[PDB]
Amino acid sequence: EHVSLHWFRHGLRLHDNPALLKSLEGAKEFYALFIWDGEVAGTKLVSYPRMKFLLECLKDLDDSLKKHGGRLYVVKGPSDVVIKQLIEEWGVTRVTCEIDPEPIWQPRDKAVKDLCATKGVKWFDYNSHLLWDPKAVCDANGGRPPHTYKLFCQVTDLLGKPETPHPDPDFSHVQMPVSDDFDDKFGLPTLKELGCEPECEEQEKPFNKWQGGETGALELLETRLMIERTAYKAGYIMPNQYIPDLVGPPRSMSPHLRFGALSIRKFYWDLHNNYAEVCGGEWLGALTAQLVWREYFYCMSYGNPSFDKMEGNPICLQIPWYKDEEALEKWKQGQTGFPWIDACMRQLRYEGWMHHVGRHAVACFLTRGDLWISWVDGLEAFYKYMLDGDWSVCAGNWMWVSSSAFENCLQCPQCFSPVLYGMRMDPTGEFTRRYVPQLKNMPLKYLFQPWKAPKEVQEKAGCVIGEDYPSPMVDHKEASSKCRRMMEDVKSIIKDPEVWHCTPSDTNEVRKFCWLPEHMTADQPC
Amino acid sequence: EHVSLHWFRHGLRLHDNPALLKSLEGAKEFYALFIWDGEVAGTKLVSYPRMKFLLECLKDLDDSLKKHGGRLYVVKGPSDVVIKQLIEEWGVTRVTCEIDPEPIWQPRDKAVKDLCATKGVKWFDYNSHLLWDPKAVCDANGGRPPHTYKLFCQVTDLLGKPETPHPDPDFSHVQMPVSDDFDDKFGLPTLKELGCEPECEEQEKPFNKWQGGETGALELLETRLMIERTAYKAGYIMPNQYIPDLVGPPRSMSPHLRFGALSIRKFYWDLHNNYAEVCGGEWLGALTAQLVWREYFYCMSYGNPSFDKMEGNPICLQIPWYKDEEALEKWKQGQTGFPWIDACMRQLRYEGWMHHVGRHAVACFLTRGDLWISWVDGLEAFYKYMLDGDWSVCAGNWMWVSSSAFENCLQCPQCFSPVLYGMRMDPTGEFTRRYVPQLKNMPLKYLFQPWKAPKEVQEKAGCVIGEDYPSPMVDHKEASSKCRRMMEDVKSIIKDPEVWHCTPSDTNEVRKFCWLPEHMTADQPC
Ligand SMILES: Cc1cc2nc3c(=O)[nH]c(=O)nc-3n(C[C@H](O)[C@H](O)[C@H](O)COP(=O)(O)OP(=O)(O)OC[C@H]3O[C@@H](n4cnc5c(N)ncnc54)[C@H](O)[C@@H]3O)c2cc1C
Ligand SMILES: Cc1cc2nc3c(=O)[nH]c(=O)nc-3n(C[C@H](O)[C@H](O)[C@H](O)COP(=O)(O)OP(=O)(O)OC[C@H]3O[C@@H](n4cnc5c(N)ncnc54)[C@H](O)[C@@H]3O)c2cc1C
Ligand SMILES: [Mg+2]
Ligand SMILES: [Mg+2]
């Protein structure tokens, strides 16, 4: 005895969706809706790659719904008017949705609820995007979010464990009306009208291909689980990670987690059950350690709309930065003069995805390594091009890498160098040569230092530095010393080391974060 | 109206076994048998690792049979008497088996058939170990086996395609009698009585762990197929292989193929069906190119008992080798003085498995690179320690790498060097340091050349060359020139380049065989 409506904003899936399950029980009619308003799902500041991903996900969702005998409605316009129009037209009595924990989505929702309060329309919301409730974690640690990963783990180890996934829905006993001339009015838009077209030939035909949806997410999860099972049988339980693979398929699910095409609880429990089936029945929490950084960065933004800025944000230190547009433009385009940085930036601009080590390298190069430019300026590029540009996680990582004044392990000019780090992470040079073809014939000895090669080598390789490939934009030795002095001044000004701010816990945490050995080794420069 | 007996020698499996399926139709009783005679399945010249693998496979087979209500009989003694005893005791009327294509297993079988001819006992055999019949291939190319891989492919492309796998058996309508006190008389032996015990502490606790059986083979096949599916979706169809992974799990099925725990036809067809499901319905023969080298080397031994020797073998060239026992013992133990060679040899002696590049490197070092010692001497070690020491494939690979006088690409001292090749295949040095702990603290600069380091570096690293780690056993520059001169003399003596002998087809085949680029590159020494 209800006419229910489920609103799709995130969580574009049908598995493990309690809010959807609640809209089918005691329901005479059912409608599925998505509203295109220009701000939902990071559409305001976006580019071609992630638009393709979003459209593919929506098409997959509609195709999945067509099996049970239903369609997905897409409407263009403000939510506060679209909802009212649909209520007055269809005759809706109940609206169900999933919660958006970020503070920038709150005033949107508060407007709808009030409306439903003045028309006798029930409202239902359920949190299925995170493992723990941010408010409970904040209350357990006084009234402020934890500022350390170890403290966050300690706090969450007392609240309990996540809940198991829910079953799948059933549409057999519910009517799902569909209007005539549906594809002409409630159909899905196209990139041709929205104004997003490829900016270069590399976007049209990238080296690595991505597909959005839910079936691909489930297949990737199955492949991940069986790879781990085979590794466990071989004898590899949580081994040290030192050699990243940059020339093969990524096999990543972060873009799917961002949009909600895969459940976090399902992944969490599948990992542990897979481990227990093979080995004994002892609990090992190190398996799901990566999934806890995501929650640690999500819960930190609770109650702070200025979490993406340096001014007015109480959990960030104030640091005097510089502003030069030429350097920033060179960094964004990929004309810095260091092949390791340029390759990663061009990969981001073409495909929209990058490995962790590259992101750390480019962030350190921009902020506290050589140039001394604010992280707010570089965060915009990641918001614009990344496939998984979460509003809170990216800003949290930027503030973690930079602005940590009292951590001296991140200020070393030898370990975090745009030459030695690239040599370590790409001994062969195939990744560098793939995205910088100008240095295809350059010997591996001078591949990362093209300006130290003689003229005969340049002529033979067909790359004269200064005409075919730009000269370096800065001297690392000189820039590093002045940046170190400037940060030492910041430390002197901020006397107390125990201030409340986002920072790493210890040095080993940094070394593991950056894929480097903990103890001293014979291959450690300074 | 029969009492059938299936004899297990190879093909220790229940899936895709036509001979087994034939012993169940029209049968009143059924017996499964394995005879331990001291020569079956490479038991005469064997060590602890492969014995463990064989025993695990037999235990898995017995456990699988116990589900349907049957056991596996194991008897110790000569086959020609055991078969007769069992025929006179049980009352057998039909014997079924699988064919062993190698010529060393023929006189064993010819004795049994004759017996069955004088007692009214039917005999049935079926070839399920190979994809093509060696006799048909030999007849299609005159009366001799093809001596080139391209010629073998050309010949086999006209015979047709392999047959699809057969169904699984059923034991419901067949009686499977079991005797009392079974575990006391027909039980499985143990390594404790056979005389195989670990020779060192590294055998007891190896770094990589192996398990024999059929379930593991099927799981490995599933993992392989889904990895390939994901790679195809990403956009990687038959890419160039240049970076081997030596610090992770092997994920190999060659030992299972050797003993017959996995079918070759099933793998062949699963690969192609997996490819067709994702991509279009066009045939691509490059997918199963590795499975054809195995058949090429198997069919070459047809009609030649001396295929494992240099004297009396018509498909091998006669070359004057040297004989020094000290050098051979150093090569076998792993005291050569070159860490790249020692690590691979110690890995073989501990675990029993090695990557292709290491096998090629050590074979070239022994035979035609530096020492000039016969391949027959080194083949014995591989027969003794390898988990997949096939009688014909290993000898064929040895004769392919060595004795190819007219192929000058394999005679280059720069590309196939025990220093540069190791640097190329192990840029980090983790694999080398895992099996040569004496050089754990040695800098990566001198890791592959410990004798060129100063004394202070040796003292700091705690490795004085000559006392803690042996000095090099030979000078590569001098050895290479004399070996080249000696092989040039062989070429001068053997005038005709078109002699009938096992040899590579072209230079690109060698370069791909050894995981090296085809065209010239800036990182090519000579
Ligand atoms: C400057 C910078 C910005 C980043 N921005 C993002 C972002 O917007 N979104 C994002 O998901 N990751 C972000 N990361 C973390 C990291 O770059 C990605 O999580 C990485 O690409 C995951 O790849 P993977 O799935 O193969 O790793 P895996 O370890 O195989 O994936 C496990 C999962 O754990 C989570 N995870 C792992 N590391 C982190 C981390 N440091 N912070 C948060 N979650 C993590 C992700 O959901 C990931 O899918 C950023 C890192 C840096 C240095
Ligand atoms: C001196 C020497 C001796 C060798 N002895 C053997 C041996 O006794 N048994 C053996 O199976 N391989 C042998 N090989 C080939 C090679 O070393 C192994 O096939 C390799 O370990 C296969 O690993 P993989 O399964 O990961 O390779 P994959 O390519 O992933 O395996 C595909 C399959 O193709 C077959 N195959 C691949 N290459 C060859 C080859 N060159 N010759 C024959 N079959 C091949 C194997 O059955 C293998 O399982 C030898 C090579 C050399 C240089
Ligand atoms: Mg992932
Ligand atoms: Mg294999």
Side-chain angles (χ1 to χ4, degrees), chain B residues 68-201:
Chain B
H68 304 78
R71 301 293 301 274
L72 179 72
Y73 291 71
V74 186
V75 180
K76 297 79 177 175
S79 306
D80 55 75
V81 300
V82 167
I83 300 289
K84 190 165 72 64
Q85 181 214 329
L86 298 180
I87 289 169
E88 269 150 75
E89 187 186 358
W90 292 338
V92 171
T93 61
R94 177 171 61 182
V95 184
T96 56
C97 73
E98 178 179 342
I99 300 178
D100 280 326
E102 294 180 338
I104 52 166
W105 304 124
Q106 299 306 304
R108 174 190 68 188
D109 302 323
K110 170 164 169 287
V112 176
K113 296 200 291 292
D114 300 333
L115 175 65
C116 297
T118 177
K119 302 180 72 62
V121 181
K122 303 287 178 299
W123 177 270
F124 186 84
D125 59 66
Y126 192 99
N127 177 253
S128 175
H129 198 68
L130 306 176
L131 300 165
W132 291 280
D133 186 1
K135 180 176 177 59
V137 184
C138 289
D139 295 326
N141 185 248
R144 300 187 303 184
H147 59 293
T148 304
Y149 178 74
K150 284 188 173 63
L151 181 61
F152 180 85
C153 306
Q154 280 174 27
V155 170
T156 54
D157 293 333
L158 255 63
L159 296 175
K161 295 183 176 179
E163 61 176 5
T164 55
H166 286 241
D168 294 359
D170 203 76
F171 302 88
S172 303
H173 306 292
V174 73
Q175 167 167 17
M176 304 162 78
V178 65
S179 61
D180 194 1
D181 61 301
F182 174 93
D183 304 327
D184 305 333
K185 169 52 66 182
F186 302 104
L188 195 68
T190 68
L191 303 172
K192 297 74 168 178
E193 308 302 345
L194 303 169
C196 289
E197 297 292 359
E199 305 170 356
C200 56
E201 52 165 283

Side-chain angles (χ1 to χ4, degrees), chain A residues 207-209 211 219 222-223 226-227 230 233-234 236 243 247-249 251 427-428 433-434 441 444 522-523, chain B residues 207-209 211 219 222-223 226-227 230 233-234 236 243 247-249 251 427-428 433-434 441 444 522-523:
Chain A
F207 199 89
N208 287 319
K209 296 126 71 70
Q211 303 93 22
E219 294 177 6
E222 289 170 30
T223 306
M226 300 215 312
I227 288 170
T230 295
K233 278 187 176 69
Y236 295 72
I243 302 174
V247 291
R251 307 177 195 274
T428 58
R433 291 189 176 99
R434 185 183 288 172
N441 303 122
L444 180 65
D523 291 326
Chain B
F207 199 89
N208 287 319
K209 296 126 71 70
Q211 303 93 22
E219 294 177 6
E222 289 170 30
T223 306
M226 300 215 312
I227 288 170
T230 295
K233 278 187 176 69
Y236 295 72
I243 302 174
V247 291
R251 307 177 195 274
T428 58
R433 291 188 176 99
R434 185 183 288 172
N441 303 122
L444 180 65
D523 291 326

Side-chain angles (χ1 to χ4, degrees), chain A residues 32-46:
Chain A
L33 179 71
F34 181 94
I35 309 178
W36 195 278
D37 60 55
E39 277 170 324
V40 63
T43 296
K44 164 152 52 53
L45 186 68
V46 70

Side-chain angles (χ1 to χ4, degrees), chain B residues 224 252 254 257 290 294 356 359 388-390 393-394 397:
Chain B
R224 175 71 85 81
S252 176
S254 39
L257 288 168
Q290 293 292 69
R294 180 179 143 100
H356 184 74
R359 308 183 199 200
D388 58 0
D390 307 60
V393 181
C394 195
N397 272 279

Side-chain angles (χ1 to χ4, degrees), chain A residues 352-414:
Chain A
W353 188 86
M354 203 209 309
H355 195 282
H356 184 74
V357 299
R359 308 183 199 200
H360 177 69
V362 302
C364 185
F365 181 83
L366 181 70
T367 54
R368 67 189 302 172
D370 298 62
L371 301 184
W372 199 254
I373 291 167
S374 187
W375 56 278
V376 180
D377 300 334
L379 177 65
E380 183 179 353
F382 278 47
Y383 279 164
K384 190 175 190 296
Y385 292 100
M386 272 296 179
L387 302 176
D388 58 0
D390 307 60
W391 185 79
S392 57
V393 181
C394 195
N397 272 279
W398 274 93
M399 270 191 295
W400 201 91
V401 170
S402 67
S403 298
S404 302
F406 297 91
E407 183 69 32
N408 297 332
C409 179
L410 293 166
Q411 210 72 44
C412 187
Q414 280 76 22

Side-chain angles (χ1 to χ4, degrees), chain A residues 73-91:
Chain A
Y73 291 71
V74 186
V75 180
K76 297 79 177 174
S79 306
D80 55 75
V81 300
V82 167
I83 300 289
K84 190 165 72 64
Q85 181 214 329
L86 298 180
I87 289 169
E88 269 150 75
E89 187 186 358
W90 292 338

